[PDB]
Each structure stands twice: as C-alpha cells, then as structure tokens.
Amino acid sequence: IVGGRRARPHAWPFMVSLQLRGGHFCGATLIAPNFVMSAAHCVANVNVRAVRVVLGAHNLSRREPTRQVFAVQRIFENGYDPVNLLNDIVILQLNGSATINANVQVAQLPAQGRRLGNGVQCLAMGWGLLGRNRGIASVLQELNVTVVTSLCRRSNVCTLVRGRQAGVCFGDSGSPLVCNGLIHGIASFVRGGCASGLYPDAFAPVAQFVNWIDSIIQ
Amino acid sequence: IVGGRRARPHAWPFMVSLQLRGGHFCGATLIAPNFVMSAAHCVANVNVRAVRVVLGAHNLSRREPTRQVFAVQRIFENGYDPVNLLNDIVILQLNGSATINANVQVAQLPAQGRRLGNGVQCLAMGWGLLGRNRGIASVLQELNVTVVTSLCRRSNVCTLVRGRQAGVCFGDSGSPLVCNGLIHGIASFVRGGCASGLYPDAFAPVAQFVNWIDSIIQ
Amino acid sequence: IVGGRRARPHAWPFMVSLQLRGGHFCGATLIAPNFVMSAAHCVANVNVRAVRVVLGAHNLSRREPTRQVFAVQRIFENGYDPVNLLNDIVILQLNGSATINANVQVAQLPAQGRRLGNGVQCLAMGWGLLGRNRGIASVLQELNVTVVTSLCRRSNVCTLVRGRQAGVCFGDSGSPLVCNGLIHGIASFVRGGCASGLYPDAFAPVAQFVNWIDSIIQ
Amino acid sequence: XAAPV
Amino acid sequence: XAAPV
Amino acid sequence: XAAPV
Ligand SMILES: *[C@@H]1O[C@H](CO[C@@H]2O[C@@H](C)[C@@H](O)[C@@H](O)[C@@H]2O)[C@@H](O[C@@H]2O[C@H](CO)[C@@H](O[C@@H]3O[C@H](CO[C@@H]4O[C@H](CO)[C@@H](O)[C@H](O)[C@@H]4O[C@H]4O[C@H](CO)[C@@H](O[C@H]5O[C@H](CO)[C@@H](O)[C@@H](O)[C@H]5O)[C@@H](O)[C@H]4NC(C)=O)[C@@H](O)[C@H](O[C@H]4O[C@H](CO)[C@@H](O)[C@H](O)[C@@H]4O)[C@@H]3O)[C@H](O)[C@H]2NC(C)=O)[C@H](O)[C@H]1NC(C)=O
Ligand SMILES: *[C@@H]1O[C@H](CO[C@@H]2O[C@@H](C)[C@@H](O)[C@@H](O)[C@@H]2O)[C@@H](O[C@@H]2O[C@H](CO)[C@@H](O[C@@H]3O[C@H](CO[C@@H]4O[C@H](CO)[C@@H](O)[C@H](O)[C@@H]4O[C@H]4O[C@H](CO)[C@@H](O[C@H]5O[C@H](CO)[C@@H](O)[C@@H](O)[C@H]5O)[C@@H](O)[C@H]4NC(C)=O)[C@@H](O)[C@H](O[C@H]4O[C@H](CO)[C@@H](O)[C@H](O)[C@@H]4O)[C@@H]3O)[C@H](O)[C@H]2NC(C)=O)[C@H](O)[C@H]1NC(C)=O
Ligand SMILES: *[C@@H]1O[C@H](CO[C@@H]2O[C@@H](C)[C@@H](O)[C@@H](O)[C@@H]2O)[C@@H](O[C@@H]2O[C@H](CO)[C@@H](O[C@@H]3O[C@H](CO[C@@H]4O[C@H](CO)[C@@H](O)[C@H](O)[C@@H]4O[C@H]4O[C@H](CO)[C@@H](O[C@H]5O[C@H](CO)[C@@H](O)[C@@H](O)[C@H]5O)[C@@H](O)[C@H]4NC(C)=O)[C@@H](O)[C@H](O[C@H]4O[C@H](CO)[C@@H](O)[C@H](O)[C@@H]4O)[C@@H]3O)[C@H](O)[C@H]2NC(C)=O)[C@H](O)[C@H]1NC(C)=O
Numbered sequence: 001i002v003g004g005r006r007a008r009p010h011a012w013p014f015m016v017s018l019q020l021r022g023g024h025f026c027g028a029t030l031i032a033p034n035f036v037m038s039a040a041h042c043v044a045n046v047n048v049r050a051v052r053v054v055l056g057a058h059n060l061s062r063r064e065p066t067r068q069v070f071a072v073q074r075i076f077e078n079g080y081d082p083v084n085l086l087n088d089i090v091i092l093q094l095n096g097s098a099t100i101n102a103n104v105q106v107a108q109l110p111a112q113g114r115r116l117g118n119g120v121q122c123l124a125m126g127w128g129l130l131g132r133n134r135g136i137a138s139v140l141q142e143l144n145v146t147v148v149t150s151l152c153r154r155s156n157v158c159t160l161v162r163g164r165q166a167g168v169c170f171g172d173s174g175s176p177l178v179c180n181g182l183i184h185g186i187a188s189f190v191r192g193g194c195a196s197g198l199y200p201d202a203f204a205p206v207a208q209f210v211n212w213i214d215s216i217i218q
Numbered sequence: 219i220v221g222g223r224r225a226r227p228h229a230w231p232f233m234v235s236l237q238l239r240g241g242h243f244c245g246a247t248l249i250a251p252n253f254v255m256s257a258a259h260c261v262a263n264v265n266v267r268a269v270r271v272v273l274g275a276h277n278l279s280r281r282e283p284t285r286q287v288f289a290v291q292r293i294f295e296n297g298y299d300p301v302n303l304l305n306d307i308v309i310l311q312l313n314g315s316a317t318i319n320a321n322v323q324v325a326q327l328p329a330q331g332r333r334l335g336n337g338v339q340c341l342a343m344g345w346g347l348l349g350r351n352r353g354i355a356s357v358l359q360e361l362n363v364t365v366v367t368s369l370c371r372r373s374n375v376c377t378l379v380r381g382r383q384a385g386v387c388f389g390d391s392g393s394p395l396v397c398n399g400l401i402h403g404i405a406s407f408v409r410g411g412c413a414s415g416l417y418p419d420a421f422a423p424v425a426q427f428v429n430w431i432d433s434i435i436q
Numbered sequence: 437i438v439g440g441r442r443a444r445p446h447a448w449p450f451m452v453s454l455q456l457r458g459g460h461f462c463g464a465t466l467i468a469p470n471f472v473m474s475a476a477h478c479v480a481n482v483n484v485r486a487v488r489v490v491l492g493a494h495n496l497s498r499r500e501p502t503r504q505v506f507a508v509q510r511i512f513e514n515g516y517d518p519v520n521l522l523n524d525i526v527i528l529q530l531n532g533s534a535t536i537n538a539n540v541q542v543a544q545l546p547a548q549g550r551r552l553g554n555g556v557q558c559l560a561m562g563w564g565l566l567g568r569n570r571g572i573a574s575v576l577q578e579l580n581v582t583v584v585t586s587l588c589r590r591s592n593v594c595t596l597v598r599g600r601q602a603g604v605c606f607g608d609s610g611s612p613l614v615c616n617g618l619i620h621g622i623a624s625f626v627r628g629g630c631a632s633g634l635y636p637d638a639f640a641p642v643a644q645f646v647n648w649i650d651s652i653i654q
Numbered sequence: 655x656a657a658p659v
Numbered sequence: 660x661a662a663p664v
Numbered sequence: 665x666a667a668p669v
C-alpha cells in the first residue's frame with residue numbers, strides 16, 4: 001500500500017499473510033476457520049508445500065504470540081487466466097482449523113453477483129510495497145479508496161484514490177477489499193506501476209464467485 | 219511528459235485530450251474538423267460511448283470557455299496488434315465538426331511513407347504523467363526530442379532525449395510527435411518505464427498511414 | 437545496478453559492454469578470446485551488424501586506451517523463449533580474437549549442471565540503470581547478492597539483497613553473476629521493477645548450458 | 655502496463 | 660518492459 | 665511484472 005496508514009492492531013482479524021522462507025509475498029482472507037482466499041497468481045508458480053499462512057499478524061517484523069501458522073493442504077482454482085488476468089482467485093485449505101478469537105476472525109462475503117456501484121467508499125489493506133523505494137510494510141497498512149467503473153473491465157472491481165497518488169502495490173495481491181463490512185475484492189493487479197494516479201487498481205470481484213466459494217467452505 | 223516544460227496556451231491547437239467521467243486518459247490530434255487520430259490502445263477496452271474529446275484545452279484542471287466537447291460517433295482501426303504493439307493508430311469520427319479558430323486548428327500530416335532520418339529534432343507533447351510520482355499534467359507539457367533508429371523497430375518512429383532522463387509517460391499516448399511542422403508520430407509505448415534514459419520511446423509512424431487516413435477524412 | 441558500488445578498474449576483466457551508435461545497452465562475458473556470452477533478449481531485435489563489443493572497459497563515459505572493440509560475426513542461440521523468458525543465453529562470435537592481458541581476461545565457467553545452493557554469496561555487476569531516476573552507470577558497478585530458491589523457478593538462478601532494496605536494472609542484462617570465482621548466471625530479468633525488495637532477480641543458469649557453450653568455444 | 659501484484 | 664502509454 | 669533487463 002502506497003500512501004495508506006498504519007492499521008490498528010488486529011483491527012482487521014481476517015487479514016492473512018502468505019509467506020515463504022524469507023517473508024511475505026501476498027495477503028489473503030480468512031473465509032472459514034480452515035480455509036483462505038487469495039489471488040491465484042500468488043500461488044501459480046510457487047511451491048505451495050512451502051507456503052506459510054500466518055493468522056493474527058500485525059507487525060510482521062516483530063514476534064507476536066497472537067499468530068497462528070498453518071500450511072496449505074490443497075488449492076481450489078476456478079479457471080485463472082494468467083494472460084488476461086481473469087478469475088484471479090484461489091482457495092487454500094489449511095492443514096488445520098484456526099482458533100477463532102479477537103485477533104483471528106472469519107470475514108463475511110457479499111451475496112452472489114452483488115455489483116458495486118460507482119462511488120462506493122472502501123478500505124484496501126496489505127503488507128505490500130509502501131512505495132517506489134520504501135520496501136514492503138512491517139505494519140499492515142489500510143487505505144481509503146473508491147469504486148470506479150471507468151478505466152476498468154466488468155470482470156473486475158476497480159478502486160482509485162482521487163487527488164493523490166496512492167493505491168495497492170506488489171505484495172498486496174490476495175489482500176481484501178472491504179466495502180461496507182463485506183469482502184468485495186481481492187487485490188489482483190495495477191496499471192502504470194503502483195499509485196499512478198491515472199489508472200484504477202483491479203481486484204477479483206468476490207461477489208461474482210460467492211456461490212463457488214460457498215460450495216467449497218459450505 | 220517527464221522533464222518537459224509548460225507549453226504556451228494554445229501554442230498547439232491541434233492537441234486533443236480524450237477524457238472519461240474522472241479525467242484525461244490519452245491525447246489525440248485534430249486531423250479534420252470532425253475527426254481525431256489517437257493510439258488504438260487508448261480505446262481498445264474503453265466504453266467509447268463515454269469518451270469525451272476536448273478541443274481547445276490547455277490547463278485541464280481549469281475551466282476554459284475556449285473548449286469544445288464532442289463524442290465519438292465511430293472508430294476506424296487499421297489492424298492494431300496489441301501483443302506486438304503494431305499499428306497503434308485509430309481514427310475517431312466526432313458527433314460534430316469543430317469551429318476552427320485560434321485555439322482549435324487542424325494538424326498537417328506528412329506524405330505517405332516519408333521516413334524520418336536519425337538526428338531529427340522534434341517536439342513531443344501531452345498531459346500524461348509528469349514523472350514517477352508527480353501525477354498527470356494540469357498544464358500541457360512539450361518536450362524537445364530526437365529520432366533514433368537504434369533500439370527501435372522500423373515500424374515505429376523512436377525518440378530519445380539525450381543526456382537527461384526525460385520522455386513520454388502514461389497518458390501521453392495518442393499524443394502527437396510533431397517534427398518539422400508535420401505530425402510524424404503518435405505516442406504508443408515506452409520501455410523500462412518512462413524516462414529510462416536507456417530505451418527510446420516508440421510512436422506509431424503516421425507517414426506510413428497517411429493514404430489510409432486520407433481515404434477516411436478525404 | 438541499484439545500490440551497488442563502484443568496481444575497482446579492471447577488477448573484473450571478463451566484463452563486456454555491448455553498444456549501439458549511442459551507447460551501452462547490455463553487458464556480456466568474455467568466455468574465449470573471440471567469443472562473448474550474453475542474454476538472448478539483448479540481441480533479439482537488434483541490428484547485430486551494428487553492435488559493438490567493447491572489452492577492457494571501466495568508465496564508459498571516458499576514453500580508455502585499455503579498450504578493444506569488435507563486431508559480432510555470428511550468433512548462436514539455444515532456444516530462447518521470449519514469452520516465458522526461458523534460455524535467455526546467446527553466444528557472439530567476434531570478428532576477431534582479443535589480446536588477453538591485465539584488463540581483458542577470459543572468465544571460467546562452472547561444470548555442467550552444477551546447481552547453486554540457497555545462501556551462496558555472489559557478485560552481480562553491470563553498467564545498467566543506477567536506479568529509478570539516476571540513469572545508466574558510467575563506472576561499472578558491483579553488488580553483493582545471495583542465491584534464493586524461493587520466488588524463483590528452477591530454470592533460473594535467483595539473487596536477492598536482503599534488508600535493502602538493491603539489485604540489477606535495465607542494461608544489466610547479459611552481465612555475469614560470479615559466484616565463487618565461477619560464472620553462474622547471466623542477468624535476464626527483474627520482477628516488480630528493479631530493486632523491489634520483494635522479488636528475487638533472475639539469471640540464465642550458465643551451468644545448465646556449459647556443455648553447449650563448450651561445443652561452441654571447444 | 656498490467657502488472658499482477 | 661514495453662508498456663503502452 | 666517480469667521485465668527482461
Ligand atoms: C500445520 O502446519 C503448521 C505449520 O507448519 C510449518 O509450515 C509449513 C509450511 C511447513 O513448512 C511445515 O513443515 C512447518 O513446520 C504446524 O505448526 C506450526 O509450525 C510452525 C513451524 O513449525 C510454527 O511457526 C513458527 O513458530 C516459531 C516458534 O519458534 C520459536 O521457538 C523458540 C523456543 O520456544 C523460541 O525461543 C522463540 O521465541 C520462538 O517463539 C516461540 O517460543 C517462545 C518461547 O521463547 C514462545 O513464548 C511463550 O512461552 C513462554 C513460556 O515461558 C511464556 O513466557 C509466554 O509468555 C511466551 O513468551 C513463543 O514466542 C513462540 N513464538 C510465537 C508464538 O511467535 C515462531 O517464533 C515463528 O515466528 C517467527 O516470528 C518472527 C517473524 O519471522 C521472528 O522474529 C521469529 O524469530 C520467528 O521466526 C513461526 O511462527 C507455528 O507456530 C505452528 N503453529 C501453531 C503451533 O499453531 C502444525 O503442527 C500443523 N497442524 C496440523 C498438522 O494439524
Ligand atoms: C456532441 O456531443 C457533445 C458532448 O456530449 C457529451 O459527451 C459525450 C461523451 C456524452 O457523454 C454526451 O451524453 C455528453 O453530454 C454535445 O455537447 C457538449 O456537451 C458537453 C456535455 O453536455 C459539454 O461539456 C461540458 O460542459 C460544461 C458546461 O457546464 C457548466 O454549466 C453551468 C451552467 O451554465 C455553469 O455554471 C458552469 O460554469 C459550467 O460552464 C458553462 O457555463 C458557464 C456559465 O457559468 C459558461 O460561461 C459563459 O457564459 C456567461 C453568461 O453570462 C458569460 O459571462 C461568459 O463570459 C461565460 O462566463 C461556460 O462556463 C460554460 N463552460 C465552459 C464553456 O467551459 C463545462 O463546464 C464542462 O467543463 C468542465 O471544465 C472543468 C474541468 O473538468 C470543470 O472545472 C468544470 O466544472 C466542467 O466540469 C464540459 O465542457 C460541452 O460544452 C458541449 N459542447 C459544445 C457545446 O460544443 C453536443 O450537443 C453534440 N453535438 C451534436 C449532437 O451534434
Ligand atoms: C573488427 O571490427 C572492429 C570494430 O569495428 C567497428 O564496429 C563494428 C560494429 C562496425 O560498425 C564496424 O564498421 C566498425 O568500424 C575493427 O576495428 C575497431 O574499430 C572501431 C571502429 O572502427 C574502433 O572503435 C573506436 O575507435 C576510436 C578511435 O577514435 C579516435 O581517433 C582519433 C584519431 O586518432 C583520436 O583523436 C581520438 O582520440 C580517438 O581515439 C584514438 O586515437 C588516439 C589519438 O588521439 C589514440 O591515442 C594514443 O596514441 C597516441 C599517439 O601519439 C599516444 O600518445 C598514446 O599515448 C595514445 O594517446 C587512442 O585515443 C585511440 N582511442 C582509444 C584507444 O580509445 C575510439 O576513440 C572509440 O572510443 C570512444 O570512446 C569514448 C566513449 O564513447 C569517446 O569519448 C571517444 O570519443 C570514442 O568515441 C572507439 O573505441 C576500435 O578501436 C577498433 N578496434 C581495435 C583497433 O582493436 C577491426 O578492424 C575488425 N577486426 C577484424 C576485421 O579482424
């Protein structure tokens with residue numbers, strides 16, 4: 001997240017951090033106690049038998065007792081198209097089931113095919129790069145953004161921060177877009193670099209998947 | 219335009235600004251009173267029934283009486299190839315015909331297949347991003363550049379600003395390259411990011427199209 | 437090279453600079469007195485009958501007597517795949533044979549299929565862009581980096597500079613990765629831009645080619 | 655540009 | 660990298 | 665993102 005602010009610890013306890021030996025590479029959502037939802041592209045070409053799913057994280061550079069670490073048992077994809085960046089969703093079934101508590105809770109999804117109107121105020125959030133030089137976040141960042149249908153396709157949900165250059169960056173993929181309490185996007189892709197100020201960012205439209213996610217978490 | 223300067227108001231009155239509900243997304247040229255020429259990629263995947271073509275613009279963030287607003291009635295493409303970025307030209311026939319005047323005049327094209335020698339001093343111009351953080355331009359920028367055949371293909375015209383890092387950026391697409399009074403390129407694409415200092419920028423070679431544009435404006 | 441330091445003159449005398457009329461576009465290695473090894477992508481779409489191979493360079497912006505200039509007589513490719521960036525190797529047979537001396541010597545390659553363990557300390561080096569604004573290098577830069585198998589495929593060798601944002605950039609392609617005295621990579625590609633701090637950089641794995649390079653230099 | 659993040 | 664602008 | 669350098 002470029003130009004966002006430090007979230008309040010565990011102010012979003014459905015927020016997951018997918019990690020490899022060295023560190024965070026993408027974000028995810030706790031959609032069930034034993035399932036997480038992220039961006040397909042994040043695990044397409046990773047050794048998923050190495051990936052760690054860290055729940056209850058806040059300051060990744062720190063040591064937090066708060067945290068619960070799983071491993072992915074299985075992946076469910078729904079026809080990612082890497083060359084058009086279509087259906088950039090996955091689900092990751094964990095080798096366990098977490099302990100729901102204050103710092104780890106399950107997100108609500110919207111209803112099947114709820115379409116987001118232009119103008120809708122949402123919150124984008126991630127541990128991705130803080131900007132064209134500043135590295136990846138230690139502390140979870142959150143960003144106020146708006147739904148924009150211009151410069152977008154209908155098979156994404158697109159956000160834009162008007163009048164500043166701010167938005168999602170590398171490693172924010174997989175991360176939720178929470179609109180009105182409900183998880184409307186997953187962080188897929190940027191145009192022009194991050195924080196272009198011109199092109200909206202693009203999120204996999206969760207409400208277009210919901211019935212699929214449902215038949216998989218029940 | 220990275221590292222260019224503020225043009226003089228209406229110092230280039232063939233310069234167009236293509237805009238969607240929020241703002242400028244690419245530039246164009248007034249080639250006839252009811253036609254404009256831009257970069258195919260600029261409208262490939264836009265709702266062209268939303269696009270606005272603003273003539274007689276200078277300081278987009280301002281309100282100028284000077285301005286004339288049309289809508290595109292029709293598009294004429296000549297075999298854009300999005301994966302090689304070949305033939306990145308379009309023509310946009312407007313729902314009207316503008317009023318030619320001091321702040322809105324029709325550009326001259328060159329002759330069919332005039333090839334630009336290496337060394338040729340030209341002027342690149344646009345309301346695209348001013349640089350890796352500074353946003354899009356309010357005030358039309360213009361940049362002195364040179365034709366370079368190295369690091370180029372023959373199916374582009376390529377420019378380079380020697381000894382500084384300067385050049386075209388996001389939203390400068392569609393915008394003219396005016397060489398010797400005549401419109402030789404359209405702003406297509408950059409390599410390495412904008413203003414790399416290493417790779418030339420690439421423009422659709424207008425003189426290779428001219429007979430096509432001619433059979434369409436007469 | 438972003439965030440590397442000035443190498444000591446001719447401290448690496450196998451280092452080559454491939455140049456076109458205006459200047460350096462990629463690096464190479466002196467693998468034999470009449471052969472050089474670079475990144476396929478560097479000459480795929482260049483007029484190789486224009487390219488200059490400058491040996492014994494240090495401060496490219498200067499005039500150095502030290503230097504020996506050849507032209508490529510022929511290219512040997514081994515199935516570059518530009519769309520997956522697979523086999524990004526070439527060999528360039530020079531119109532002569534250089535004079536081996538203190539400022540021009542032949543690199544050692546490793547053995548066929550030597551695989552590099554995670555953790556291996558190496559030296560990356562190049563005259564490519566010094567960073568998101570600072571241009572290309574005048575003076576050869578060198579950078580201490582580590583082999584990382586995460587965020588990588590097996591058909592590359594990948595490096596990462598931990599705890600800073602540093603790494604290879606545009607024009608560093610073709611350039612050697614020298615590990616333990618031996619040439620283990622060629623500079624192919626970056627993810628996220630240069631110096632992302634998140635994604636490793638990727639090098640063509642020379643030890644996977646060696647028997648091929650051998651049947652061509654003997 | 656489209657870069658996947 | 661080639662990004663269309 | 666993969667840009668060839
Ligand atoms: C499923 O799976 C899972 C996972 O797995 C994994 O992954 C995958 C992918 C694969 O790879 C596999 O193989 C693997 O293994 C399981 O489990 C899990 O595991 C993981 C791993 O194993 C984990 O994670 C990690 O962990 C860690 C730990 O470590 C350490 O230890 C030591 C000893 O103890 C120490 O010292 C340190 O500190 C650390 O820590 C810990 O410990 C401590 C102590 O010290 C504790 O504390 C506490 O206690 C005490 C007593 O007295 C008291 O006082 C209190 O108060 C406190 O203090 C704590 O600390 C702990 N920790 C925490 C909690 O945090 C960790 O640490 C890590 O982390 C990290 O962080 C940071 C950042 O990086 C850093 O700095 C650090 O260093 C580190 O690194 C991680 O997390 C996990 O945890 C687990 N999980 C759980 C348990 O939940 C399983 O089993 C499975 N399941 C099934 C099968 O079903
Ligand atoms: C073709 O088509 C066209 C177009 O269309 C469109 O587009 C497309 C795409 C689609 O979407 C459709 O649907 C659409 O609609 C047509 O027409 C055109 O239109 C357009 C739209 O409609 C336009 O544009 C726009 O416009 C505007 C206007 O507004 C306003 O108004 C109000 C009331 O009036 C005001 O208040 C304001 O200011 C504004 O302005 C105007 O007004 C005023 C007044 O105030 C004026 O002034 C003048 O007057 C007075 C009286 O007394 C005097 O004093 C004098 O001196 C002066 O002052 C002026 O101002 C006006 N304006 C101008 C000129 O500028 C506008 O405004 C807009 O703009 C913008 O700018 C900036 C930036 O953004 C901002 O700030 C602002 O706010 C705004 O937004 C635009 O431009 C146009 O114009 C039109 N065109 C013409 C007319 O040319 C058509 O019809 C067609 N054709 C055919 C069909 O054939
Ligand atoms: C193979 O091939 C090769 C190559 O070729 C080329 O390339 C190709 C690609 C194609 O294009 C073709 O066509 C071409 O041509 C051959 O050969 C080679 O060549 C090249 C070219 O030709 C070369 O290079 C270049 O060179 C140059 C030279 O120039 C000049 O000169 C003048 C007169 O001399 C002068 O003035 C100046 O300075 C320069 O230099 C030179 O000279 C001088 C004098 O001044 C010298 O010095 C010395 O001497 C004296 C006497 O007294 C004494 O004192 C001493 O001490 C000293 O001083 C020197 O300087 C020289 N130089 C040098 C060495 O360096 C050059 O210069 C150039 O460079 C550059 O650098 C910089 C950067 O850019 C700049 O600044 C400058 O300006 C310049 O530009 C270049 O390098 C080469 O060299 C050659 N190589 C050899 C010889 O080795 C061949 O033949 C062939 N082979 C076979 C066929 O087999």
Ligand SMILES: *[C@@H]1O[C@H](CO[C@@H]2O[C@@H](C)[C@@H](O)[C@@H](O)[C@@H]2O)[C@@H](O[C@@H]2O[C@H](CO)[C@@H](O[C@@H]3O[C@H](CO[C@H]4O[C@H](CO)[C@@H](O)[C@H](O)[C@@H]4O[C@@H]4O[C@H](CO)[C@@H](O[C@@H]5O[C@H](CO)[C@H](O)[C@H](O)[C@H]5O)[C@H](O)[C@H]4NC(C)=O)[C@@H](O)[C@H](O[C@H]4O[C@H](CO)[C@@H](O)[C@H](O)[C@@H]4O)[C@@H]3O)[C@H](O)[C@H]2NC(C)=O)[C@H](O)[C@H]1NC(C)=O
Pocket residue numbers: 121122123144178179180181182
């Ligand atoms: C940027 O984005 C954020 C987030 O965006 C939203 O949420 C995300 C998740 C997505 O869903 C987006 O789509 C959403 O837009 C936007 O932030 C929102 O701002 C609102 C105001 O504009 C605010 O709503 C108003 O809240 C009033 C009640 O507020 C209480 O209670 C609610 C419910 O619990 C709580 O959410 C509020 O934050 C606030 O909570 C209390 O706060 C105090 C102070 O911190 C606490 O007191 C301290 O507590 C500590 C505890 O240790 C200690 O004890 C201290 O001593 C003590 O002082 C207290 O404990 C909290 N209570 C509880 C129970 O937790 C409502 O009355 C009001 O309603 C009325 O007005 C609205 C506006 O007109 C009307 O729409 C409405 O109909 C009513 O008329 C509002 O609801 C939101 O809560 C806030 N949302 C979030 C998630 O923070 C932000 O607007 C945006 N900015 C811009 C620029 O876009």
Ligand SMILES: *[C@@H]1O[C@H](CO[C@@H]2O[C@@H](C)[C@@H](O)[C@@H](O)[C@@H]2O)[C@@H](O[C@@H]2O[C@H](CO)[C@@H](O[C@@H]3O[C@H](CO[C@H]4O[C@H](CO)[C@@H](O)[C@H](O)[C@@H]4O[C@@H]4O[C@H](CO)[C@@H](O[C@@H]5O[C@H](CO)[C@H](O)[C@H](O)[C@H]5O)[C@H](O)[C@H]4NC(C)=O)[C@@H](O)[C@H](O[C@H]4O[C@H](CO)[C@@H](O)[C@H](O)[C@@H]4O)[C@@H]3O)[C@H](O)[C@H]2NC(C)=O)[C@H](O)[C@H]1NC(C)=O
Pocket residue numbers: 339340341362396397398399400
């Ligand atoms: C960066 O790029 C720019 C632009 O590049 C060119 O143009 C673009 C569009 C592309 O086509 C590129 O391919 C082109 O290269 C380059 O700028 C050019 O610089 C030239 C000098 O190097 C200059 O040419 C010389 O002009 C002399 C005459 O100048 C008059 O008249 C012409 C024609 O009208 C006009 O264009 C000039 O600007 C100048 O105009 C007068 O200016 C004065 C001062 O502003 C005005 O007076 C003021 O007016 C206001 C009005 O309200 C008020 O009344 C004030 O009180 C008053 O003082 C006056 O009104 C203007 N008159 C008119 C009628 O408008 C020629 O004599 C000279 O020719 C001789 O020399 C040349 C060089 O040796 C020879 O080639 C030639 O054969 C002759 O020997 C030149 O033509 C260009 O006009 C200028 N082009 C543009 C479009 O600006 C620039 O070089 C470049 N820099 C570099 C670093 O690359």
Ligand SMILES: *[C@@H]1O[C@H](CO[C@@H]2O[C@@H](C)[C@@H](O)[C@@H](O)[C@@H]2O)[C@@H](O[C@@H]2O[C@H](CO)[C@@H](O[C@@H]3O[C@H](CO[C@H]4O[C@H](CO)[C@@H](O)[C@H](O)[C@@H]4O[C@@H]4O[C@H](CO)[C@@H](O[C@@H]5O[C@H](CO)[C@H](O)[C@H](O)[C@H]5O)[C@H](O)[C@H]4NC(C)=O)[C@@H](O)[C@H](O[C@H]4O[C@H](CO)[C@@H](O)[C@H](O)[C@@H]4O)[C@@H]3O)[C@H](O)[C@H]2NC(C)=O)[C@H](O)[C@H]1NC(C)=O
Pocket residue numbers: 557558559580614615616617618
């Ligand atoms: C960043 O990377 C660099 C480079 O990385 C390595 O190399 C590249 C090419 C890749 O292959 C990578 O895989 C490699 O990792 C790393 O730099 C290395 O640091 C080492 C120390 O950590 C150092 O090794 C130790 O060297 C001792 C002997 O040193 C002498 O001799 C050797 C051989 O000649 C030479 O390489 C050394 O630099 C040093 O050379 C002498 O230096 C002096 C001072 O400059 C010279 O004296 C001056 O000379 C001028 C001449 O005009 C004038 O006369 C002045 O008056 C005079 O003072 C002198 O002339 C030089 N002599 C010669 C003959 O040239 C060893 O004893 C030691 O071994 C012991 O310790 C090791 C560590 O525990 C053990 O492993 C080992 O078993 C032994 O126990 C080491 O070998 C390396 O040389 C150096 N490599 C390079 C290429 O520079 C660097 O570590 C790294 N940093 C990090 C953060 O990752």
